[PDB]
């Protein structure tokens, strides 16, 4: 098992240090590599450390900017990246002997931005107006202006799962994230069924339950 430290949020120019605690083998016996992956982008090798000697080798892209270390005493390897830039926003993974396979950490999300942590505003996306009787209606919640990732959305406390789509957030020019979570439902249920979106943004310890009701004219 390879278990990494929690998510990080950093300002540009700052540094981050991620940990990778190992178990179930002789830690000093195998190379540990780190690989990162920007949101919706490929994999990018950063460097390896030999836990036995503490000798390292880094990708040219990060040379002089990354330091890999280890504490054999607690079977933990570390990756420290300095002079952080917004382009450094990515999930960072440790992998034992990536060249000769095999085992990966769960990953550590690091977000680099001048933006500060903020809870989302949750706006209703009122049930779709139907010019003609009988059909499907769409409704949802707009979870706007939060930072950083991630947020979680459920409907009716997880009771409503069919036809739910919680979209990948977009990064607005402001530096804040916004996403929509929609559900399609029979139009006939709008009169009788209550719809609540349950939003949880753990980075700001914010929790909102928003009732999404038909417009007053409906």
């Amino acid at each position: 098992q390879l278990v990494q430290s929690g998510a990080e949020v950093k300002k540009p120019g700052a540094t981050v240090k991620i940990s990778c605690k190992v178990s179930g083998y002789t830690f000093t016996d195998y190379y540990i590599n780190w690989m990162q992956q920007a949101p919706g982008k490929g994999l990018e090798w950063i460097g390896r450390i030999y836990p036995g000697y503490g000798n390292t080798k880094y990708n040219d892209k990060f040379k002089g900017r990354v330091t890999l270390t280890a504490d054999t005493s607690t079977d933990t390897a570390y990756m420290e990246l300095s002079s952080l830039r917004s382009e450094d926003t990515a999930v960072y993974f440790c992998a034992r002997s990536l060249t000769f396979f095999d085992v990966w950490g769960q990953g550590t999300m690091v977000t680099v931005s001048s933006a500060s942590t903020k809870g989302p505003s949750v706006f209703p996306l009122a049930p779709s107006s139907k010019s003609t009787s009988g059909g499907t209606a769409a409704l949802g919640c707009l979870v706007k202006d939060y930072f950083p990732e991630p947020v979680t959305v459920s409907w009716n406390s997880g009771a409503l799962t069919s036809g739910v789509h919680t979209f990948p957030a977009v990064l607005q020019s402001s530096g804040l994230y916004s996403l929509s979570s929609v559900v399609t439902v029979p139009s006939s249920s709008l009169g009788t069924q209550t719809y609540i979106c349950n939003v949880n943004h753990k980075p700001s310890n914010t929790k909102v339950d928003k009732r999404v009701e038909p417009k007053s004219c409906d």
Binding site: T99, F100, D102
Partner: protein, 215 residues
Amino acid sequence: DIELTQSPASLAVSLGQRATISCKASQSVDYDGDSYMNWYQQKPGQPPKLLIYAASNLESGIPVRFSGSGSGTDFTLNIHPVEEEDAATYYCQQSNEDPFTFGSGTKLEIERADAAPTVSIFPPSSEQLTSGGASVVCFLNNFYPKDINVKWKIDGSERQNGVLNSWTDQDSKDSTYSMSSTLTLTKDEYERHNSYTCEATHKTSTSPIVKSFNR
């Protein structure tokens, strides 16, 4: 540094069809008694997962339908009964001589029957209106192909500024795409006009799908 050249950059096949991708190394990766070439599969928002190592050895857990072939400089990954499940980017990586390097990757996308979007429009919420904001949202769900155009009209005239669009990843099950279009106006702009409509132009129809409401 060994350069890994993958091709094509993207593939688009129907479910059940066979696909082959190529990975060429700038120099032979043959050493010991094996070629230090591995293939990884990376699904959206997931860490990469190994498929093949030693150019042709399957990792335990990986189906037979994933086959790695090649030696020296020319390598290939082949996927038989392709399914929506396989929608990801496939990378090859050489582990012969440091630094270890990855190919640019080959994005596997699936083809399917054209599907018209299910369009829903949502007036600004009472909550948002209480402040100085008014966003009008349209959901364009479960359509194909991905190519689609949305036009917003206020009292019959197009509005191009203050719209944010977002597309979902190709659906992992039915291979469709969904998109959201949000038109943000001031509370004053919203209350100043009456008719709000989003028009979806997709190849599935000669005429755009129109959803609209009057304040």
